[PDB]
Amino acid sequence: QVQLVESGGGSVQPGRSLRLSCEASGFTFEAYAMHWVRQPPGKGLEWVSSINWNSGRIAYADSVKGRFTISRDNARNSLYLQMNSLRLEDTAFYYCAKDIRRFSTGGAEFEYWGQGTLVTVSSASTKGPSVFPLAPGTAALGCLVKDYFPEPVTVSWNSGALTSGVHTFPAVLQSSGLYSLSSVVTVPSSSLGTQTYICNVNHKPSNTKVDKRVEPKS
């Protein structure tokens, strides 16, 4: 099964540079043209760049021509996108995509996409979150993940053993320039003295991972 994992995202200052990478497996990478597509959060889709199987053919969208350089390493099943002179409007999820055709040279048909890496172009500096408990027939509890930058945080419960009833809310930007969000879950009231509830908070841009036990208060 085809797999595509982008990395290199995070926040970067306007005017500076950032190099994104994509790791591929589950197909013959050196037989396929590869593509970058981007999407600013909450918006539509915009093709960025294409490179064919042997790097003999390369194309760019006008919005990035002269600033971005696409490249690949067939020996390492890897696709690269060097981005220079970044502007705020380059803020976006960057997706890696594998063409449907073998050994094509022109155009672009997007068959499989990686889940994307988020690039935040900003003057703000990177900051890890604080995690606070939202303490408890049905009971609600959760965690409050406050004052971090940039997006994203992911939240699981009991390490993925608890999915039913979970709402992790879209983050919102506070007037302070930091993000905040809550993840909550509804569970049986009968379980609160017996069942342990831990939210697992992950903020890759700051290399922060937090397991927060959420208990009923005194």
């Binding site: 939202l134 809310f169 506070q174």
Partner: protein, 217 residues
């Protein structure tokens, strides 16, 4: 820049047939294959239709696409709540030495019956208070439709300019929405009042619901 025009939204009841239009030009749709992509919330676009009407294996046959002149169309038969997503068409455009054009995108909403929210309120934790700030969180769980009025009263005084709302996308199993509303105060302002209350008025309620607590109980 060039774009293919799609309606911003489309809806249907479960089991109905929703169709999404996509209009472009003679140099893109009129000349090249049309692709369709489905984007579920929190995920990357996934290939839904290729080459105007081909289905990748794994895509149910209730998805079909068609191209005619400078227009294309997607049809979702047997609409299911799992189909709540954004849909994009796309085609290559031969003008200006060639470039890839995406549609503006359509959000598909599954229509269902009105459902009142379940309301919970969470006082600030002492761990947060000990750093100088108080967040009070009001949770609205699984309600329909999306519009809702969520207000804060502190000792019965209506609040303004100190709360932020967040709403989930339509749930993939029950087609409802959830919403958080978060009131923020400094420790010192939080400490000078007693009753904290969020009131929720919604189409599934015959009259507003209030959840409240007394600071320190």
């Amino acid at each position: 820049q060039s774009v293919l025009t799609q309606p911003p939204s489309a809806s249907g009841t479960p089991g109905q047939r929703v169709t999404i239009s996509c209009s472009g030009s003679s140099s893109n749709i009129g000349s090249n294959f049309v692709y369709w992509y489905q984007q579920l919330p929190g995920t990357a676009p996934k290939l839904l239709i290729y080459r105007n009407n081909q289905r990748p294996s794994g895509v149910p046959d209730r998805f079909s696409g068609s191209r005619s002149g400078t227009s294309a169309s997607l049809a979702i038969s047997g609409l299911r709540s799992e189909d709540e997503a954004d849909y994009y068409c796309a085609a290559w455009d031969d003008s200006l030495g060639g470039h890839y054009v995406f549609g503006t995108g359509t959000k598909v909403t599954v229509l269902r019956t009105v459902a009142a929210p379940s309301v919970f309120i969470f006082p600030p934790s002492d761990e947060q208070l000990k750093s100088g700030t108080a967040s009070v969180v009001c949770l609205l769980n699984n309600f329909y439709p999306r519009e809702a009025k969520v207000q804060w009263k502190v000792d019965n005084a209506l609040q303004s300019g100190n709360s932020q709302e967040s709403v989930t996308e339509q749930d993939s199993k029950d087609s409802t929405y959830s919403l958080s509303s978060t009131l923020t105060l400094s420790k010192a302002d939080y400490e000078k009042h007693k009753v904290y209350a969020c009131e929720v008025t919604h189409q599934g309620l015959s009259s507003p619901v209030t959840k409240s607590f007394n600071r320190g109980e």
